[PDB]
């Protein structure tokens, strides 16, 4: 009834060079949709996991740095988890590290090291009032899965330190989800 | 404050007799609808039952066989626990029961059994997100009981296999509702 | 199968103001009936709770003083429970309180101050024996919830100290009645 | 992090005199939102209070006469909870009060009483299907704190006797809220 | 890391009526085959569970049968399991029920009544020597799951007595499965 | 109330390449103002967290290195905690370390590695005498939170060995500190 698993995907994130001589910061953010972790399925399956409920349990996100150890410009920056879907607003070079001071800030040192961030995070169910629920086991809602309309999720907000150089990595995210409810159709022939 | 109690309603279904040679099945839905339960009060009791919210708490779904023991082209088919709202497409003649894999399907036995199914069933809270809460008790969300637009709980899905013959039943639902708020009014 | 809930109403009371100057108390008498708590219901449920049977539990009796505090011509009565429908002939001035040496007379205080009473009353099953039960909680009669011809229960007698002013109480009288056997038809559209 | 805290305001209320002779109940209701308590805030932070979420833990309603207590025709009323945000419709003189057989009501005394309720109110999630969650503590919904538009949370039904006089009060509402996760920006200059 | 599940299909099977008087025994066998359970999936998934190896823990065959219990010319018969692939020849009216004294032999009662079989089958490896091993669980073969063409596994042989009616069945089968090794692609 | 936080900024410091043949210090110091950390506020709350009063438990100065850690000519430095606001005269190119025989130093390396110091820093009461409290809880004094012109705190000095490359760090400077009386004002529309 039950099927634990763990799903990934990896793309590119580049910060490129500026010439601001005064420390500033590029400012992003980033929300998880299983529709980026599942792909369609086939026939009368239409999702590639044949199930009828799920629930995201964890997310991680790892920043796998490309620069070499070499690099010099060092900076350093914040993540933070958001789960309200609202994020600072998209910056190349905010004055201020504006992820600093929350309360659930990590900090991210740059540009040759890892950086992840593990944490429960929150569908975004009605983006209006943005609320959700304590970070929990038992009580967490189910979701349908859906085969193309699925919902956000809730994440991470970054601002990065800008330098000399770009600043390229690539991100890892994986989500572990609880699927629930078996559902594989069976047609003959 | 509280009132457990149970509200039935009876109502028939015919699945109808087909030609077509091989096994064949007649996939349906089922929600239910508290307006269907409670009629409507009178004066400044605009419910039958005076509270003012309520949840259900369990459904339960009974098929009562119309066919006699004596009948045969006697088939195999499935019921299975729908909670997100999302049932497989309605069908005369599908060539399999698609609900037979499903984690909670259980048996169904044709065309004069009985056959039953109890769980905790769920609002429709959003239908494009399709959300729901884990199986519980104190921390189930309470609904404001309306005189009329109430909002479809969910539930079960089905797959009876086709016959040779007509298929007749009275399906009883019983839903075990607990109230909340007693909220009598008294005119002079 | 039980439904045990709470009733209530709020109705006037007014003693007019005498004359009179030796002291003279107005008498009166209190009956409960579930008439007066439960409207109508509609259509196939006739009544407003969806119970066949019932029985009174208790009933409280408050006086709710609406003289304020600064009004003179205090005085002093009696409150009777009478279980046997058989009160003192009602009275404007009568020469004395005829409740005083009743054996459950509580002292009413006038015409600022709370008054209440609580009870088991008793139904008037046959207002020629005047017959009830001794109070009691399993054996306690069943009676039908009728619509229309409810019976009446018998509780209280009154008898108020008049005064040079009037004296004016709202009264709220809750029944405490508990409910057998859910009834409640359901005809379909 | 969290923090804990209270909020309040202050505001008026009156039930103008009448000359129905017969009992009658003033019926309103009352909403509680955040907006109220907690005004806007300056520069790169838009909220007095840097918190990026809330939820209401409790809410006291006070309802503080101002009516002298040698004031006359003194009334009884009452207050109920509602959560549902499904409250009796307004009215001037209803001829009874609605909300007397409530379960969570409480007897009002007038015009000269304190009246206190206190209670976890619930956000107005849904108000087609107007539903709210048990009352718990960690289990409950957290909500964004919003510059503007914040959800009404939901609360009380009133319902005043009507007197011959004037009734005034001071009405005062306190929000026990819960923050979580400080969020100050700090830009430089 | 694991996943258990259930698979099942339903089809049908006649026993044509005969006017062979003294007794006789329609006689098949049964063979399993994920093919039939499991169809095929999409894009760079190509199966619909996503596991490259699974095991065939457990078999379920469910005769359901049509007639009705009014039926006469009752009868009796046998169903066995071959673990070896090797059943009795298919035969319309073979004139002695030739599973009868097998060890693993059940009853089977006709027309009207319910019959199944459970037990762990085996994949056909080599069909020239024919081996299987010893009922086991921790030292079971692992199979890779195919998209194209699954290895048989191995089962069930059945007779049953003719009649002078048709004797029709819903047969259902059910696959009790483990999966191992989640395999899911995720193209961008 | 009582609030524990935690406030941050971060500004850059060079200190520029020369030529000079034997070892050489680059002598500077560090004040901490939490006018620097704390934006103001708005209307009536006339600073970005609503309290009374205020004092530092602890700072965290980090030295976030810019140079690579292939870059070479490195050196070793002296970080040192001056509580009294009396810091070694500022100074390019020193002949010796001056902080280096402080029994509160630490050994800074340079140029690619992290420094940091942690210490409850102290406020400048009187820069004539200059006197502080022993290091305690709860004994610290209680400040006001001032909008405009709060009192340096102090805390470090630090001496850099000059090198034949520039060296950038990034600064992070981090208080941690106690907010006491909340004090939001809440004026209405």
Chains 1, 3, 4, 6 share one sequence.
Not at 94 to 101: E, K, Q, R, S
Not at 163 to 183: A, C, G, K, L, W
């Amino acid at each position: 009834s039950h099927f634990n698993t763990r799903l990934s995907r990896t793309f590119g994130y580049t910060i490129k060079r500026t010439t601001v001589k005064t420390p500033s910061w590029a400012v992003d953010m980033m929300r998880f949709n299983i529709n980026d972790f599942l792909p369609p399925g086939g026939g009368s399956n239409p999702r590639s996991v044949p199930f009828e409920y799920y629930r995201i349990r964890k997310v991680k996100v790892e920043f796998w740095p490309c620069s070499p150890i070499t690099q010099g410009d060092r900076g350093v920056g914040s993540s933070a988890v958001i789960l309200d879907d609202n994020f600072v607003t998209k910056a190349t070079a905010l004055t201020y590290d504006p992820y600093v001071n929350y309360s659930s800030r990590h900090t991210i040192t740059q540009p040759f090291s890892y950086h992840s961030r593990y944490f429960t995070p929150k569908p975004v169910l009605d983006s209006t009032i943005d609320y959700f629920q304590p970070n929990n086991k038992r009580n967490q809602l189910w979701l349908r899965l859906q085969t193309a309309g699925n919902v956000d999720h809730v994440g991470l907000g970054t601002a990065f330190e800008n330098s000399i150089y770009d600043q390229e990595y690539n991100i890892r995210v994986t989500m572990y989800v609880q699927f629930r409810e078996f559902n594989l159709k069976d047609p003959p022939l």
